[PDB]
A = this chain, B = another copy of it.
Amino acid sequence: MSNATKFGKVAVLLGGKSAERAVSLDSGQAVLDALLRSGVQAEAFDPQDRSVTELVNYDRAFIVLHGRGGEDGQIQGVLEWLNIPYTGTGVQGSAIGMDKVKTKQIWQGSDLPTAPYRIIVVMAEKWITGREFTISFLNGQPLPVIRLQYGIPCGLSETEEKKLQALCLRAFQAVGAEGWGRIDAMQDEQGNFWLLEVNTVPGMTSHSLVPKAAKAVGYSFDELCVAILEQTLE
């Protein structure tokens, strides 16, 4: 049972219209090479150069557009209307995820910790000092946590780490994200966690954090790319 047949003609959506275009071209190229190596019939699709109307020629879509259009529900919209299954988070989770105030609102509304904030678009947030982390997701489940300013190990105890993972899984589900993505979190001076933001189509460049964390659990980049694409089976 081959990946040519099984996944059919897949479009790797890349580049796009946003300020993160260059990063997305990089993420796209990486993913495209990896899927081609895995024998999936992948092709590049840049919606800034090719009308989305031509998506109708493809059986599924690997979304690796960052920012406006990609991370915010728009392209997910068009794919729903063309009946083309696709990677990651649907319209709702995407549209929310790319709005901090809305992401915070729905987190507060789920009994989940996050800095207070006020109505100034950029907002005004309560300053907390501590160390930032990021919990990456694959198949709905969290992966090994990475410290931000190397990255792993993070500097949490094994139980302290699992606490941050379980908390972030709730914040991932709360906002209705699915498949894969990233949650950023804080740890204040007293050891308490605070949720910061969500990325519903993360970077897939060589320096990007999700492949790093997927590798920590034995996924090659090519394996990680197929795992993500498997979401598009029903």
User: Measuring CB to CB, which residues of chain A are less than 8 angstroms from any residue of chain B?
Assistant: 47, 51-53, 56, 69, 72-78, 80-82, 91-92, 95-96, 99, 102, 104-110, 174, 176
Contacts and interface: CB of A to CB of B under 8 A. Distances in A.
Nearest to A99: B92
A228 to B, nearest CB: 21
A110 B102 contact: no
B109 A91 contact: no
Per DSSP, are chain A's interface residues mostly helix, strand or loop, or mixed?
helix
A80 to B, nearest CB: 5
A73 B92 contact: yes
B91 A72 contact: yes
Contact of A106 (B72, B76, B91, B109): B109
Nearest to A98: B92
B95 A105 contact: no
Contact of A81 (B47, B80, B109, B174): B47
Given A74-B80, A92-B99, 20 more contacts: A51-B53, A52-B81, A52-B82, A53-B56, A69-B81, A74-B77, A74-B81, A74-B91, A76-B77, A77-B78, A77-B91, A78-B81, A91-B95, A92-B95, A99-B176, A102-B106, A102-B176, A105-B174, A108-B108, A108-B109
